[PDB]
Design a protein around this ligand. Structure first.
Ligand SMILES: CCCCCCCCCCCCCCCCCC(=O)OC[C@H](CO[C@@H]1O[C@H](CO[C@H]2O[C@H](CO)[C@H](O)[C@H](O)[C@H]2O)[C@H](O)[C@H](O)[C@H]1O)OC(=O)CCCCCCCCCCCCCCCCC
Ligand code: CLA
Ligand code: CLA
Ligand code: CLA
Ligand SMILES: C=Cc1c(C)c2cc3nc(c4c5[nH]c(cc6nc(cc1[nH]2)C(C)=C6CC)c(C)c5C(=O)[C@@H]4C(=O)OC)[C@@H](CCC(=O)OC/C=C(\C)CCC[C@H](C)CCC[C@H](C)CCCC(C)C)[C@@H]3C
Ligand SMILES: CC(C)=CCC/C(C)=C/CC/C(C)=C/CC/C(C)=C/CC/C(C)=C/CC/C(C)=C/CC/C(C)=C/CC/C(C)=C/CC/C(C)=C/CC1=CC(=O)C(C)=C(C)C1=O
Ligand SMILES: CC(C)=CCC/C(C)=C\CC/C(C)=C\CC/C(C)=C\CC/C(C)=C\CC/C(C)=C\CC/C(C)=C\CC/C(C)=C\CC/C(C)=C\CC1=CC(=O)C(C)=C(C)C1=O
Ligand SMILES: CCCCCCCCCCCCCCCCCC(=O)OC[C@H](CO[C@@H]1O[C@H](CO)[C@H](O)[C@H](O)[C@H]1O)OC(=O)CCCCCCCCCCCCCCCCC
Ligand SMILES: CCCCCCCCCCCCCCCC(=O)OC[C@H](CO[C@@H]1O[C@H](CS(=O)(=O)O)[C@@H](O)[C@H](O)[C@H]1O)OC(=O)CCCCCCCCCCCCCCC
Ligand SMILES: CCCCCCCCCCCCCCCC(=O)OC[C@H](COP(=O)(O)OC[C@@H](O)CO)OC(=O)CCCCCCCCCCCCCCC
Ligand SMILES: CC1=CCCC(C)(C)[C@H]1/C=C/C(C)=C/C=C/C(C)=C/C=C/C=C(C)/C=C/C=C(C)/C=C/C1=C(C)CCCC1(C)C
Ligand SMILES: [Cl-]
Ligand SMILES: [Fe+2]
Lengths: 37, 50, 31, 342, 75, 34, 39, 52, 334, 29, 37, 65, 37, 37, 31
């Protein structure tokens, strides 16, 4: 039905990239020793 | 006034009839950003930083 | 074999730390 | 303002020394009824008929050993209403079955509700964003998960945290011995949040106090700040340089810093709440099965984890008899798990 | 009016040279009378145990709790 | 009319006396092992 | 009507006449007496 | 008495190390002349070239 | 214009990405050595006879541990607090048998964190910022010295220091509670107050600063971008937050002064952690927490239990089960 | 009277309980 | 060590999927910033 | 923008956005029913909690048979 | 049937890594196209 | 050493995205039955 | 368990085919 006026860009600056990567890797480190059992 | 009339089933909601349209735009975020004047100290500091 | 996964995860966290310290977005003053 | 509801609203929201608000109609009674109840239960009421303990200053206890002990285990999860089928309107028997704990806990839940509603109300009337009411959700989650959902998953209110100091220490060691809650990754995330929040508080205080701008000629620099000034009282650039070249990374954005200071403790509390909700159903990260099997088949395989498991067995066996008197546990000296000598 | 302005006022202290000690002593006679032990059911130093009751008293039923409480607390 | 420094002095003295009476009761009578 | 049901109904009545009604009456009287100005 | 003396003097030794750190830092800052704060006019950091 | 002068300028340079300075000269090698030996010993190290009874305990990943159970085991109890470098061992294998890597890592790490305190002071002097961030760091370091160094000194064995692992940390906690009753010791209670209050004030301060942020951002944009790095103006209304918090509790409680607020923020956790580190330092020499066991007795004189007694039962279970094969005599005097 | 009510609701139980506690120090078993 | 076998998939994919999500969110955003200029 | 048969059929059901009855309207009966539903929830909560024992209401597994 | 266990990781990750690479290359290109306008 | 003149954008149109996804998924289908064994 | 992987891979290929048919880049004539 044509272009949507509600379209917006999405961003993730580099500080947020490093924060997210650190969170995911640390969660993996924490919960791997519990998933393997 | 009567019992059934008192509940005003007939009158829409017991107190409800002839409804107005609300005007306020409830989905509205204010956008009155504020300008802070640049002091002379600010100009000196940004000059040194540049 | 889990030592492989543990070592890989710890090394990945250390690598993320390295890249965050040394390849950060440089702070600069806006205009 | 004319209508009766408008008049009540105008009076409740009056700007006086103590803001009342509509939430005050829920906070001030219950909160009061909670705190005095504690001060009553920790001062005159006993745990002799529920736990076999003395828990009041009257019985001889001090601030540490005095507590409002949980109800008897036979009560189950009864609401312990003073008019209920247990006390049946008798105040003395109600206090003797530990119904005062139910009073304090149930009034404290609604006091927390009223205080969060108070935060929302004052934020709305003052006209700021409601981030303080959402940060109190962390404490609300802690109270709900630890004092309500944990005993509701267990056999009775008896296993809830008894409201005291030594009582809370006993709850800590009981939960460790029976659930091994230190091994729980959600508890680990929670203690990470708590210690990281304390760390953020300390570093932020030191950094702000130590990058202050020279706004006076007095060695004591507290007087050199004005509440209404439109100038930052400390150097963000200098602090950023310090922490960047000391620690490699540093905050560059005050708003991000202060949201982070909010997020760390709140995230810790919610994470630990998930772990305690797990512990309510005995869904506990008690053991690593691989190491249990290896130690079962290899009697020379020892880790600090196995030593912790042995300590938990010791806690359980040497604590059950006096900690759960309703069970009537008689463990002879033969069956008690011990070590050589001591 | 401000807190210090009230505290240093003489009238405050004419009121609270009499009001505060009255209830400070009311608590004293509340417990010295032994009334707390009766309202709150707390055993005295000579009531934790008695004949045939050299063991800890415990309520073991939800609904008959009052009944066994009297039975145990007959004294 | 009464200097607030004297009020603070006497009030803190009385509060410390009450807490010390609590401490004595901690070393005497019920609640003490003796 | 069991004793528990009588106790429950009595609890509702006393909650009305000891908590809700007194607090509401006090709020109404105080709000009608001490009124804001220029509303 | 050994426990009392040892604990008390270990406590006071640590406390006086903290006092040394405080007073030595303040002595250096006051001698250099920035123990009251950072001068808004001549901030050293703004003169420094940005890292990274 | 001299080689030593150029070297001193480079060491004390504010142009290096990471500041070195003279304290960094001692910190970087020590911390790097500790990191290297810790990583190598955690991934791969033979079991260590911690208790001096020829019962090795595994702590390395290769010997059947996970990240949670892995640790660098404390030194052997036979060593005591004798210095045990590599060159004092007949072979490297028997250096690893008796937990020498723990001594190496602990010594280098303690020296490195001391260097970190000094380096924090140093950069501040170069910056021209006020000192004392260093003083705040001491509280974490003090606790680390209390657990890794002072507790072995008081008890007389590096086997008694905290293991460099997660499960070993829990083991050290439980044994410390069993032997000293740290929970009832008031300095640990001050530390608990310190950390809980630090979390409370962190959440409160962050909430109030984030709540009163001045509108400088559009609706399709993160509010954090309303602040520009290095700006002169305040990014939030201190008056709004102060008034909200005054209405929340009462006016007098609120910190109308921001500098006093941040001093209190830096003070509460630092003093709490100082006190708990000092408490561990004092329980190293066996000045234990309170012992209210059997403090309530009836008129006849028989013990009416309290919560202290029930806590004592857990402490006693941990006491009897800890180090089952190490004790030959009834008292745990060591 | 709201100021009176709040401050005295806090105070009256406090002094009553403190008097009871100071008496309770002397129970002497 | 009798460890689980799907725990390998659990740990590795629960690390991988969020990590690639973050990397994509960063690269998209940067690309857009470069394209704007 | 787009007109459809179902859109035309359902348009009257989405044609009074923002229409509000003036004043308090039906709020009193809303509050009364709120009170009644609160009482009902309290009754059933106390029934299962066994703080409100009703004759011929045996809250137990054994009541099944 | 008895089959290998690392073959699960082999198949799943050898499908995942190129797939996320392609998805990232597409999103990044699109984001740049949108940013240009 | 400043901005590189050799910087160029990189693209993957949607047709290429579908081609790559199809190739990777079909390779996974083909070689999974050989990796499991 | 390999039937899970086989079915997932075949379904993923079918999904890619679906999205390629129905969410293609529409052909248009340039100017
Ligand atoms: C946020 C803001 C929160 C504000 C907090 C407001 C205050 C909360 C008050 C909640 C009171 C809940 C009491 C409860 O639940 O009361 C419990 C009773 C159930 O009673 C228990 O039931 C058990 C099961 O018994 C059953 O099984 C037995 C088997 O022998 C017998 O057959 C027995 O007859 C039969 O009833 C045992 O009988 C226990 O002794 C008895 O106490 O349920 C009932 O009242 C109601 C049960 C359904 C609703 C409960 C929803 C809330 C709690 C959910 C938590 C579930 C646990 C998950 C934890 C994780
Ligand atoms: C903010 C006010 C407030 C709140 C939220 C609560 C909340 C609570 N109190 Mg209460 N309480 C209050 C003030 C408050 N209290 C005050 C001021 C006092 C001191 C006098 C007490 C004294 C007190 C005691 C002594 C006890 C409680 C208890 C309780 C709990 C049970 C409530 C219950 O089921 O009551 C019954 C239900 C109600 C009161 C709601 C009434 C609803 C309407 C108004 C009734 C309408 C009547 C209806 C038309 C009748 C028709 C007949 C029938 C067909 C229905 C709950 C946590 C109990 C507890 O904690 O046990 C552990 C308990 O034993 N409270
Ligand atoms: C580094 C050490 C450490 C740390 C930081 C923590 C941290 C935590 N532990 Mg603990 N814990 C530890 C070691 C540690 N633990 C160890 C070694 C053990 C095993 C022995 C345990 C065993 C353990 C258990 C069993 C539990 C915790 C829990 C918690 C959480 C408590 C949250 C809180 O503030 O509650 C404080 C309480 C609240 C915030 C509730 C609301 C409080 C209200 C607002 C108070 C209002 C009072 C009012 C003004 C009246 C005052 C009156 C006055 C007279 C006093 C938190 C994540 C709890 C948890 O996980 O909960 C989810 C929990 O149940 N821990
Ligand atoms: C909710 C309950 C609770 C709470 C809040 C606490 C709180 C605390 N307990 Mg615990 N404890 C609990 C329950 C609880 N406990 C229970 C139930 C028990 C009985 C078993 C104990 C038994 C117990 C013991 C026996 C001890 C504690 C200690 C502590 C403190 C730990 C934090 C500390 O001092 O950090 C301060 C900071 C540090 C220790 C960290 C040092 C940081 C160094 C300097 C730098 C490290 C650099 C690093 C290696 C590399 C960086 C990497 C880079 C890439 C970033 C704290 C006060 C400990 C304590 O007080 O120690 C002094 C302690 O010894 N507790
Ligand atoms: C044990 C630690 C702890 C305590 C004692 C505590 C206490 C407090 N929380 C408050 C606030 C906050 N706490 C916050 C975050 C946190 N709070 C934390 C942890 C704590 N918070 C943590 C870790 C965080 C980080 C997320 C925020 C963000 C706020 C606030 O905004 C608020 C404030 O204004 O602070 C200045 C204050 C006001 C609460 C109130 O009015 O409740 C209303 C309820 C009352 C008065 C009744 C209490 C009912 C309780 C649950 C049961 C009865 C308790 C007994 C009377 C006493 C038990 C004694 C023990 C020994 C068992 C008060 C000082
Ligand atoms: C062989 C190997 C490697 C061995 C390792 C073995 C081993 C045992 C492994 C450890 C495993 C491990 C990593 C597991 C951790 C798992 C765990 C429990 C994770 C918790 C995760 C979780 C989701 C918790 C939720 C709570 C949460 C959000 C906590 C976050 C904590 C956090 C990062 C807090 C901040 C800490 C911190 C250091 C802050 C520094 C800030 C700093 C630089 C200040 C800068 C600054 C301050 C100012 O004030 C001003 C003004 C300016 C300008 C300024 O700049
Ligand atoms: C019962 C009951 C309500 C008890 C309340 C107990 C009580 C008086 C608590 C006060 C706690 C305390 C000392 C507050 C200061 C903590 C602090 C750092 C909060 C953050 C903060 C405070 C401000 O005061 C302003 C101004 C801003 C900005 C701000 O963040
Ligand atoms: C309302 C505001 C009230 C202020 C709070 C008071 C809460 C403490 C009550 C103390 C009590 O009554 O002890 C009363 C007890 C009474 O003392 C006991 O009396 C008994 C009588 O038989 C026996 O003699 C016992 O041996 C004796 O110890 O006092 C003490 O034991 C002395 C210590 C008092 C120290 C109290 C301050 C501790 C601060 C706690 C921190 C609160 C948490 C705040 C978190 C925010
Ligand atoms: C500002 C100013 C503040 C003023 C504060 C005043 C508070 C003190 C009020 C009560 C003091 C009572 C003194 C007394 O008789 O000793 C009573 C006991 C008995 O000792 C016993 O003493 C006995 C010998 S003797 O008869 O006392 O000589 C001995 O045999 C026995 O072993 C021993 O336990 O001694 C104590 O332990 C009292 C400790 C009180 C300490 C006050 C703490 C204040 C903190 C605030
Ligand atoms: C000589 C000795 C040198 C030793 C230096 C070692 C420094 C270590 C660096 C850690 C930073 C990690 C990246 C953080 C993420 C990051 O890039 O943050 C960078 C971030 C910059 O934020 P800005 O304010 O620029 O962001 C504003 C924007 O976000 C807009 O919203 O600063 C911080 O928040 C860092 C403060 C937390 C610093 C502690 C981080 C947690 C450390 C834990 C690491 C895990 C260890 C596990 C290993 C298995
Ligand atoms: C409980 C219950 C049951 C059923 C119905 C009923 C409505 C009655 C309901 C509620 C009852 C209520 C709310 C009762 C009220 C009682 C209250 C508020 C009691 C509180 C008493 C307060 C006390 C001791 C305070 C003692 C404080 C102390 C030492 C402080 C120590 C200190 C001193 C002395 C000097 C300086 C240092 C320091 C630490 C500050
Ligand atoms: Cl021995
Ligand atoms: Fe700040």
């Amino acid at each position: 039905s044509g272009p949507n006026p509600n379209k917006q860009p999405v961003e993730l600056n580099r500080t947020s990239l490093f924060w997210g990567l650190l969170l995911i890797f640390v969660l993996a480190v924490l919960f791997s020793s519990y998933f393997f059992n | 006034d009567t019992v059934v009339s008192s509940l005003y089933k007939s009158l829409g909601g017991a107190l409800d009839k002839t409804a107005v349209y609300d005007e306020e735009d409830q989905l509205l975020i204010l956008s009155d950003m504020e300008t802070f004047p640049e002091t002379e100290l600010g100009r000196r500091r940004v000059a040194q930083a540049e | 074999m889990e030592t492989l996964v543990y070592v890989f995860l710890l090394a990945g966290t250390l690598g993320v730390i390295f890249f965050a310290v040394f390849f950060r977005d440089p702070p600069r003053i806006a205009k | 303002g004319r209508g009766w509801f408008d008049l009540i609203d105008d009076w409740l929201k009056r700007d006086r020394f103590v803001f009342v608000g509509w939430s005050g109609l829920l906070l001030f009674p219950t909160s009061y009824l909670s705190i005095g109840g504690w001060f009553t239960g920790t001062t005159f009421v006993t745990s002799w008929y529920t736990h076999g303990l003395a828990s009041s200053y009257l019985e001889g206890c001090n601030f540490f050993t005095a507590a409002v002990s949980t109800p008897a285990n036979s009560m189950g999860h009864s609401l312990l209403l003073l008019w209920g089928p247990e006390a049946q309107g008798d105040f003395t028997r109600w206090c003797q079955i530990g119904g005062l704990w139910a009073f304090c806990a149930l009034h404290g839940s609604f006091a927390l509700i009223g205080f969060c509603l108070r935060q929302f109300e004052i934020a709305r009337l003052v006209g700021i964003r409601p981030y303080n009411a959402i940060a109190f959700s962390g404490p609300i989650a802690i109270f709900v998960s630890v004092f309500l959902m944990y005993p509701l998953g267990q056999a009775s209110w008896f296993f809830a945290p008894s409201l005291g100091v030594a009582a809370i220490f006993r709850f800590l060691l009981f939960i460790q011995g029976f659930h091994n809650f230190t091994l729980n990754p959600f508890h680990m995330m929670g203690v990470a949040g708590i210690l990281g929040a304390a760390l953020l508080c300390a570093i932020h205080g030191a950094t702000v106090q130590n990058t202050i701008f020279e706004d006076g000629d007095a060695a004591n620099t507290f007087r050199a700040f004005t509440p209404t000034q439109a100038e930052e009282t400390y150097s963000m650039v200098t602090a950023n340089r310090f922490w960047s070249q000391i620690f490699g990374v540093a905050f560059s954005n005050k708003r991000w810093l202060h949201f982070f200071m909010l997020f760390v403790p709140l995230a810790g509390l919610w994470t630990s709440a998930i772990g305690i909700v797990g512990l309510a159903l005995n869904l506990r990260a008690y053991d690593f099965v691989s190491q249990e099997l290896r130690a079962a088949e290899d009697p020379e395989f020892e880790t600090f984890y196995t030593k912790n498991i042995l300590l938990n067995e010791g806690i359980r066996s040497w604590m059950a008899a006096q900690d759960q008197p309703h069970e009537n546990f008689i463990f002879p000296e033969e069956v008690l798990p011990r070590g050589n000598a001591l | 009016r401000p807190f210090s302005d009230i505290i240093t006022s003489i009238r405050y202290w004419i009121i609270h040279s009499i009001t505060i000690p009255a209830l400070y002593v009311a608590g004293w006679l509340f417990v010295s009378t032994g009334l707390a032990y009766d309202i709150f059911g707390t055993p005295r130093p000579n009531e934790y145990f008695t004949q045939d009751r050299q063991q800890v008293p415990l309520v073991n039923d939800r609904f008959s709790a009052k009944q066994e409480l009297e039975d145990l607390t007959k004294g | 009319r009464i200097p607030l420094w004297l009020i603070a002095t006497v009030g803190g003295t009385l509060a410390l006396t009450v807490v010390g009476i609590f401490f004595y009761g901690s070393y005497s009578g019920v609640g003490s092992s003796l | 009507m069991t004793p528990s049901l009588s106790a429950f109904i009595n609890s509702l009545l006393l909650g009305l006449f000891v908590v809700v009604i007194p607090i509401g009456a006090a709020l109404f009287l105080v709000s009608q007496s001490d009124r804001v100005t220029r509303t | 008495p050994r426990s009392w003396l040892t604990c008390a003097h270990f406590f006071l030794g640590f406390a006086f190390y903290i006092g040394h750190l405080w007073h030595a830092g303040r002595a250096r800052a006051a001698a250099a002349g920035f123990e009251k704060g950072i001068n808004r006019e001549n901030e050293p950091t703004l003169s420094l070239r940005p890292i990274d | 214009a001299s080689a030593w002068e150029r070297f001193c300028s480079w060491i004390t340079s504010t142009d290096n990405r990471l500041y070195i300075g003279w304290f960094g000269v001692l910190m970087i090698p020590t911390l790097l050595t500790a990191t290297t030996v810790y990583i190598i010993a955690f991934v791969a190290a033979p079991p260590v006879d911690i208790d001096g009874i020829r019962e090795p305990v595994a702590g390395s990943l290769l010997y059947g541990n996970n990240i949670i159970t892995g640790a660098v085991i404390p030194s052997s109890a036979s060593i005591g607090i004798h210095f045990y470098p590599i060159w004092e061992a007949a072979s490297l294998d028997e250096w690893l048998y008796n937990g020498g890597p723990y001594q190496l890592i602990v010594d280098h790490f303690l020296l490195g964190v001391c260097g970190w305190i000094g380096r924090e002071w140093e950069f501040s002097y170069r910056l021209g910022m006020r000192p004392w961030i260093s003083v705040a760091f001491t509280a974490p370091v003090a606790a680390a010295s209390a657990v890794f160094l002072v507790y072995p000194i008081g008890q007389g064995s590096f086997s008694d220091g905290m293991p460099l692992g997660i499960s070993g940390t829990f083991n050290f906690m439980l044994v410390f509670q069993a032997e000293h009753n740290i929970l009832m010791h008031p300095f640990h209670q001050l530390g608990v107050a310190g950390v809980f209050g630090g979390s409370l004030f962190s959440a409160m301060h962050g909430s109030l600063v984030t709540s009163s942020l001045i509108r400088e951002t559009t609706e399709n944009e993160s509010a954090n971008y309303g602040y520009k790095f290095g700006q002169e103006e305040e990014t939030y209304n201190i008056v709004a937050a102060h008034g909200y918090f005054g209405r929340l509790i009462f006016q007098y409680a609120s910190f109308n002064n921001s500098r006093a607020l941040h001093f209190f923020l830096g003070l509460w956790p630092v003093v709490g952690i100082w006190f708990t580190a000092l408490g561990v330092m004092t329980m190293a020499f066996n000045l234990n927490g309170f012992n209210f066991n059997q403090s309530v007795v009836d008129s006849q004189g028989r013990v009416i239990n309290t919560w202290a007694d029930i806590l004592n039962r857990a402490n006693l279970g941990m006491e009897v089960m800890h180090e089952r094969n190490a004790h030959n005599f009834p008292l745990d005097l060591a | 009277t709201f100021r009176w009510l709040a401050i005295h609701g806090l105070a009256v139980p406090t002094v009553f309980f403190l008097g009871a506690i100071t008496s309770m120090q002397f129970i002497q078993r | 060590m009798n460890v689980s076998v799907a725990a390998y998939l659990a740990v590795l994919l629960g690390t991988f999927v969020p990590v690639v999500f973050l990397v994509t969110l960063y690269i998209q955003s940067e690309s857009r910033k470069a394209g704007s200029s | 923008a787009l007109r459809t048969r179902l859109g035309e059929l359902l348009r009257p059901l989405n044609s009074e956005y923002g229409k509000v009855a003036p004043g308090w309207g039906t709020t009193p009966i809303m509050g009364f029913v709120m009170l009644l539903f609160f009482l009902f929830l309290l009754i059933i909560l106390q029934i299962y909690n066994s703080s409100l024992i009703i004759e011929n209401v045996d809250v137990d597994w054994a009541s099944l048979g």
